[PDB]
Each structure stands twice: as C-alpha cells, then as structure tokens.
Design a protein around this ligand. Sequence first.
Ligand SMILES: CCOC(=O)c1cc(O)c(O)c(O)c1
Length: 454
Amino acid sequence: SMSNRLIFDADWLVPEQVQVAGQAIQYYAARNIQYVQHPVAAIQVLNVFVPAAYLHGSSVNGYQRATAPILMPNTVGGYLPGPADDPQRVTWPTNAGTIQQALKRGYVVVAAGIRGRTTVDKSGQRVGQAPAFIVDMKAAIRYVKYNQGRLPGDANRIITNGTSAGGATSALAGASGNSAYFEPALTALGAAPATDDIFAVSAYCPIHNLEHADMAYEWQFNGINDWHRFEPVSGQLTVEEQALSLALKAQFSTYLNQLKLTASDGTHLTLNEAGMGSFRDVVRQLLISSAQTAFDQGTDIHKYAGFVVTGNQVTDLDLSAYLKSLTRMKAVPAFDQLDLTSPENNLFGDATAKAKHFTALAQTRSTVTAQLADAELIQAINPLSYLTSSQVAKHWRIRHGAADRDTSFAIPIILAIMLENHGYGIDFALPWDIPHSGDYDLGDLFSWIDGLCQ
Ligand SMILES: CCOC(=O)c1cc(O)c(O)c(O)c1
C-alpha cells in the first residue's frame, strides 16, 4: 500500500556468515523488502546483503560503506520469474555462489525478485509477461537510488548482472536508463521517485534482440538440418522448416546491412546475398581469438572441427565445419515459433493471450490463430533500440560461450559492435568451449569491476 514509504533502514541488517573456499565470509542481510508500494505478485521483493566491515567503520578491497559497488544480479532464466536471491540459497534458480564471492570482494549486493511469464496475481491473472521483468528490475534500481546513503554502497555505481534472459535483463537496464516508455508502469506500481540509469552492465549470453534472432540463427545454422536440445530431444528439419531457414538466412543480410556497423579502422561491416562478407569475418576472427586463448593454455581445440593451426598459432577457421560439430540446438523458427510454443512467444503474451508472435514472418506463416505483439513493446525491450531516448551505462562487459548454441554468435556481437561504434566502453569475448551458462569467470569479472570503481 501507500503506507510503504520505501525508506530503507540499516537497522534491518542482521549478521550472518557463509563458509566459502577455506574462509568464513561475514555479512549482514535484510530480506524480503517490498520495493514498490503496489506490488502485483509476491515475488516482488528484494534482498540486501552487506559486507560486515561496512557496519563496523571498516573497508573491504579498497571500498567502504559509501563507495562500494552495488551488484544487482538477477535469477531470471528463460524469461521465467526470478526469485530474490540469497547467498544461503540452494534451490534452483540461484547465483548464491556469486553473491558469496561478491561479498568477499566487498560489493554490496541487492538481489531483486522479478516477475516472469508464468507469474500470476491474486485472481490468477498473468501479470509477469513483457515488459514486467524490466519494469521490476527498474523498480528495484529506483528503490536503491532513492535510498542512496541509507543503503550501504554507492548508488552511482550500480552494476547489473545476469545470464541468458537474465543477461538481456541486465543489458536492457543498462541501455534504457530513465526511458519514458516505462514511466506509466512504474507509476502504476508506486516505485520510488528516483532515476534508474545504472553505472555498468555485466551480461552472460544475453538472449535479446528477439525480433531479429530468428534471422541471425538461420544465417548461422542453415545447412545443418538436424537439431539437438529435462529430456534429450531431437529432430530433423522439414522442407518447410528448410524453406524458412534459407529465407531467414537471406533476410539476415538485409537487416545486418542496414545497421551500418563498422570495424575499428572504419569499414562498414556487411554481408552479401549469400551471407558472406566482412561481418562474417568478424564472427570468425572472434572464434579464432577464443581458440587461440585456449590453445595457449594447452587445451585441445580440435574437440571441434574447422580450426587451422599453423605452428603455435590458430591462423584460420572453417566456420561451417565448426558449426556442424557445435551442432544446431533449435528448430525453425528458433525464437518466434509458428505454433506459439517458445518461451519468447509466451513472454510476448498478455493477460488475454498466453503467447504472441513478434515478427512479420511467423505471424504470416502462423500455424495457430495468433496476434502480433505491439511494435513499441518489442522495440522497448530490445537493448539495441536505445543505442540507435535514455541515458545509457558507459561500461559494458559481455560474454557468450563459444559452445553456446542458444542464440547465434551474431547477436552478442552486434550488441558489442554498436556499443563500440557509439563510444561506450565494451569488454567482449566468446569464452572457449563454454556452454549456455554464466558467472564462470568471476575472477575476471570482479577485476573488471574493480578497474571501473577504484
Ligand atoms: C535455458 C537458460 O537460458 C535462458 O534463460 C534462455 C532464455 C531464452 O529466452 C532462450 O531462448 C534460451 O534459449 C535460453
């Protein structure tokens, strides 16, 4: 209700510890904070965790109570609801281990719970489909920022983190700070009256740019006709699927070209009608760079086909061979399925429709009665749209595993290039033989954060 003043009180913080890696880590916790006045779902609370030193005058890793970074991780996966996390948490889904490490690192952590596509309200009405997830994420950011100086850590040093859908969530938050589009939703929630622009973005395999992901996917996996994706399940593409695949691949050239992406010197990155060109060379060079890094560590990079090694250097790559050994994960279309059965179909549904299309192609060739999601909505939840009406985070670190087949490498790469083309700081890589996952390189992530904040 409006009796909730959204005022944080450090006296709520109570001491706890967690034994991790030969050390007990001392911290304080304040759990289940209602971060908006008018929540529609019980999941809409946030936890706050604080290195013990910050309640005793002391410092950790060069940070203090007023200066510490605020890590805002989320537990969002598959665009499902992400409960408020907790270093003591051991039920799926959780990044408790990351929270432990971030506390050890001296970060304040604010783990907000976020509605997802399956979330329902008191009556059993869906209230977690787009753009609920980013609205909630923003509402939690606003809470923190409204509470600057009551809440430990620096609210001008918020750094979101997330994996997959959670990665897109982190990314979208960094891209869309103070976007007018979300104002009516936040106001309807009674979120705190403060800004929601953040400082830095960490994102692992962000499943974003959803309305172009079908094109990017086929540009990559066309020619590979068997797919493999909890139960082991697999199929073989139909002629119809193959038709869509070939068409989706072709269309990707047209989309990619109009982006006007450029390389470091200044060359327009392009593709011809057959999907070949300087942009494909960039993808290839990034995989080559990923393989070299592993090679230098004594890793057998020939686990996957295609790599040319000359002496001690990965000099080239047969991209098609690699992709064939990587294997295709999703059928066609990969994201906007024609029978509305994908997570993203469900994501774009509403209180009325469980699922919608979000591309012209899938709406046109729909095998089930369906409507197209609002064009402004699709646009609003795509990070890329804010780079080409908001204040954007200036610092980004993006990772997508070279063994991750959940979305085309082209998706994170486009994001990284746009960021770079437009003057943002951007640390990008496709970590060798890394599957769909996140938080696997915390030592480098934390070092990157420490580079920004100290
Ligand atoms: C399965 C874990 O990762 C996900 O969050 C995720 C989300 C999506 O929207 C996807 O399309 C996907 O392949 C994975």
